[PDB]
């Protein structure tokens, strides 16, 4: 999407994962999906670093309605769990320096059952540009045919640019075609900043490999279309939660990196490790995620259980990855000549190796001829940063 | 088996799962099957507060012998990964005051497919006797007959019997006799003091849920059989190494606290995190495991992605986990009536609780009426343990 966003990956943090459709606001008044969450995550952004590690756009997903239009037929926020409205959590986000996004959805109903936007397109763009809204979060539930999904996702994107605000705007048309038809991904980019190819993530390192079993089964048809404008989108950060080891963290935040992925973390902010923080801080590693040059990485090998990726990076640098997916036993030794990394120009005549995950380490210089050897932890990630001496 | 020994579950610490077969010493040294790591390993279990929370066995797993048999017939130790011989490893163990484990096979070959120890039984007991092995895993590879399996199993229990030393007597046969029928866990506990059930595990929520699900779905079967000198081993403890979350690691020492399992741990000592140390010496939890009443828990409840089970333990106290098995969102609230607990004895007319894990907190006086009310971390477990009280 040409509207000059998005130049980088977003950055930010979506609700979904962690907190769902949690209404029960008497019960649980700290995590029902309300005004009062969304002012705690902001201020934690501000006053935990998040901002200044590059992470701006604090994000509404579904369950913020209210269960009908107004008066004029506009969508409205839940008057008990958003007494203020969402122009004012606008307000309230951006001056904290944050970017607010919200949800809705192509078809007849929200997911969760909540007002659906077909019919109410260029309203609802409207509405949303009224209350400040820099980002859109825009769903394919109930929705009955390909064509009103297509027609939808492209008319919102019109109607959206038509307002004259800055919107970033997230499409899930193609998780929604995949099933039926395959989709055109030039076509998709033509509209959207950045797209949902798959299914959602939960808090399980099961869905993180299917995740990127998934983007490595199909990476010819999606890895070149990615670039400043447009991105693939591989679902939210789930690190910090519960359900996954630290190895799985790292290897979590090395791919998203090396995918070019939106990273939105959906966590409680509230609770979170100092180690989960740090993983999710590292400047190194979001640098290569947010690399101007915007190529998005691809898996180079797979074999005997390990698997290589790799993102060309600004300035003859090169970003590698290599997963350990065997599941038993301990730190496996992997090998690989650094001729045969970076399509045989990162290393020649000569690179500078940096391990940035699981740690930080300064491996050396490596020669043309030389191979590179690290050990992997099972279901973890080396990642390293590649620097020709050109 | 009425040896006298495994009168509460054998704790100790067992190699397969972290270090499995790796014979590259030169390559590999750190990770190799070799006599140093098991040294060195004797050495943090004493030095890092190991055997004081119980973990006496240090248990020697496949890829230890030599390719072929000695001149004599007997067994041998790998030559260049075990110089020294089992007999002065079993030494260097003793005087760190811990005991030693060793591994072999029913079938002709074990499964990484060294000698076998069908057609050398006693012979082969008696080596091990020799040596002053405390312990033998008997794994059954290599025997496609159920009666070579059954009359292996049962020969080796007797030829161990024979030589006249303390032997725990770890056995695999239940698991091995799937493909052909479903074990008499009557006979094998006559013959063994702990039984493997079902598939190895390894490092990965994935199995840890299979091996519960497994448990659960067959506890008619295999619960009241446990008791002191017979035990149904779920496999090792695998906190410490690199696939469970906190809250999975959580999960697997608070269920195999309740499943009266024997606590092998398979991780490396000497790269072990504060956090998993501190989560597998929990003196609490492995006072539970280690309940002189040796009945082993079972599933409750299950429903709505929760689990409830409760292990009875001696005095009329109660240890109860509660299980989240919703693997998205945040923690979920679970309440449940104190007289649903314990089979209603346990807080008739009260019960004082104190929660274990995933933090120890003193949660206070229950009475018989009253609701206990918790919140669980997605694939966590929270572990209570209920005292019958006659005050407030
Ligand atoms: C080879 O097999 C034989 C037969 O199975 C086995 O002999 C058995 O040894 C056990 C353990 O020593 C004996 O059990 C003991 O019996 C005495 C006398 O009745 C009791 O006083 C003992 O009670 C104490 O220990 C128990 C734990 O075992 C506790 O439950 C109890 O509270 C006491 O602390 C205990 O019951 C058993 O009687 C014999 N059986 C026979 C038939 O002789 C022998 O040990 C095996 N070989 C080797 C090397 O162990
Ligand atoms: C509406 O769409 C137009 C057309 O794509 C966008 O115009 C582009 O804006 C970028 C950044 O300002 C320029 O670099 C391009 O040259 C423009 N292209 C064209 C064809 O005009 C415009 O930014 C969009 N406006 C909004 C508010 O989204
Ligand atoms: C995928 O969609 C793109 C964009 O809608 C199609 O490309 C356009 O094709 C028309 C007609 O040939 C050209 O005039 C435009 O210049 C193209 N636009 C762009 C942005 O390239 C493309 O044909 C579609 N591909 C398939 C296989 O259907
Ligand atoms: C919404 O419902 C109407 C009436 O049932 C239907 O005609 C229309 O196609 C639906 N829209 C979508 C996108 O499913
Ligand atoms: C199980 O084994 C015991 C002891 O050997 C025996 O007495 C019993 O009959 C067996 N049960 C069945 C059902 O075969
Ligand atoms: N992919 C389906 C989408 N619908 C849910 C909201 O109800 C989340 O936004 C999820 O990402
Ligand atoms: N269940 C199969 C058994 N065989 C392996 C050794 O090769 C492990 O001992 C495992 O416990």
Same mark, same amino acid.
């Given at each position: 999407?040409?509207?000059?966003?998005?130049?980088?990956?977003?950055?930010?943090?979506?609700?979904?994962?962690?907190?769902?459709?949690?209404?029960?606001?008497?019960?649980?008044?700290?995590?029902?999906?309300?005004?009062?969450?969304?002012?705690?995550?902001?201020?934690?952004?501000?006053?935990?670093?998040?901002?200044?590690?590059?992470?701006?756009?604090?994000?509404?997903?579904?369950?913020?309605?209210?269960?009908?239009?107004?008066?004029?037929?506009?969508?409205?926020?839940?008057?008990?769990?958003?007494?203020?409205?969402?122009?004012?959590?606008?307000?309230?986000?951006?001056?904290?320096?944050?970017?607010?996004?919200?949800?809705?959805?192509?078809?007849?109903?929200?997911?969760?059952?909540?007002?659906?936007?077909?019919?109410?397109?260029?309203?609802?763009?409207?509405?949303?540009?009224?209350?400040?809204?820099?980002?859109?979060?825009?769903?394919?539930?109930?929705?009955?045919?390909?064509?009103?999904?297509?027609?939808?996702?492209?008319?919102?994107?019109?109607?959206?640019?038509?307002?004259?605000?800055?919107?970033?705007?997230?499409?899930?048309?193609?998780?929604?075609?995949?099933?039926?038809?395959?989709?055109?991904?030039?076509?998709?980019?033509?509209?959207?900043?950045?797209?949902?190819?798959?299914?959602?993530?939960?808090?399980?390192?099961?869905?993180?490999?299917?995740?990127?079993?998934?983007?490595?089964?199909?990476?010819?048809?999606?890895?070149?279309?990615?670039?400043?404008?447009?991105?693939?989108?591989?679902?939210?950060?789930?690190?910090?939660?519960?359900?996954?080891?630290?190895?799985?963290?790292?290897?979590?935040?090395?791919?998203?990196?090396?995918?070019?992925?939106?990273?939105?973390? @959906?966590?409680?902010?509230? *609770? /979170?490790? &100092?180690?989960?923080?740090? #993983? =999710? !801080?590292?400047?190194?590693?979001?640098?290569?995620?947010?690399?101007?040059?915007?190529?998005?990485?691809?898996?180079?090998?797979?074999?005997?259980?390990?698997?290589?990726?790799?993102?060309?990076?600004?300035?003859?640098?090169?970003?590698?990855?290599?997963?350990?997916?065997?599941?038993?036993?301990?730190?496996?030794?992997?090998?690989?000549?650094?001729?045969?990394?970076?399509?045989?120009?990162?290393?020649?005549?000569?690179?500078?190796?940096?391990?940035?995950?699981?740690?930080?380490?300064?491996?050396?210089?490596?020669?043309?001829? @030389?191979?590179?050897?690290? *050990? /992997?932890? &099972?279901?973890?990630?080396? #990642? =390293? !940063?590649?620097?020709?001496?050109?």
């Amino acid at each position: 999407l040409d509207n000059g966003l998005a130049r980088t990956p977003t950055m930010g943090w979506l609700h979904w994962e962690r907190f769902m459709c949690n209404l029960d606001c008497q019960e649980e008044p700290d995590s029902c999906i309300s005004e009062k969450l969304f002012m705690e995550m902001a201020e934690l952004m501000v006053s935990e670093g998040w901002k200044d590690a590059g992470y701006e756009y604090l994000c509404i997903d579904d369950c913020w309605m209210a269960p009908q239009r107004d008066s004029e037929g506009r969508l409205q926020a839940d008057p008990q769990r958003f007494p203020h409205g969402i122009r004012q959590l606008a307000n309230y986000v951006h001056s904290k320096g944050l970017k607010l996004g919200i949800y809705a959805d192509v078809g007849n109903k929200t997911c969760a059952g909540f007002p659906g936007s077909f019919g109410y397109y260029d309203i609802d763009a409207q509405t949303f540009a009224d209350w400040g809204v820099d980002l859109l979060k825009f769903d394919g539930c109930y929705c009955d045919s390909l064509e009103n999904l297509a027609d939808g996702y492209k008319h919102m994107s019109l109607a959206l640019n038509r307002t004259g605000r800055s919107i970033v705007y997230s499409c899930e048309w193609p998780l929604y075609m995949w099933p039926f038809q395959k989709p055109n991904y030039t076509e998709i980019r033509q509209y959207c900043n950045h797209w949902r190819n798959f299914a959602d993530i939960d808090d399980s390192w099961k869905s993180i490999k299917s995740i990127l079993d998934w983007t490595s089964f199909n990476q010819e048809r999606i890895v070149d279309v990615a670039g400043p404008g447009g991105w693939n989108d591989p679902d939210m950060l789930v690190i910090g939660n519960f359900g996954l080891s630290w190895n799985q963290q790292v290897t979590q935040m090395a791919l998203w990196a090396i995918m070019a992925a939106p990273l939105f973390m @959906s966590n409680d902010l509230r *609770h /979170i490790s &100092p180690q989960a923080k740090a #993983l =999710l !801080q590292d400047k190194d590693v979001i640098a290569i995620n947010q690399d101007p040059l915007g190529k998005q990485g691809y898996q180079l090998r797979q074999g005997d259980n390990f698997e290589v990726w790799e993102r060309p990076l600004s300035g003859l640098a090169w970003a590698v990855a290599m997963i350990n997916r065997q599941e038993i036993g301990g730190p496996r030794s992997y090998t690989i000549a650094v001729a045969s990394l970076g399509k045989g120009v990162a290393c020649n005549p000569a690179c500078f190796i940096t391990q940035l995950l699981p740690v930080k380490r300064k491996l050396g210089f490596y020669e043309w001829t @030389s191979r590179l050897r690290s *050990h /992997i932890n &099972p279901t973890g990630t080396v #990642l =390293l !940063q590649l620097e020709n001496t050109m």
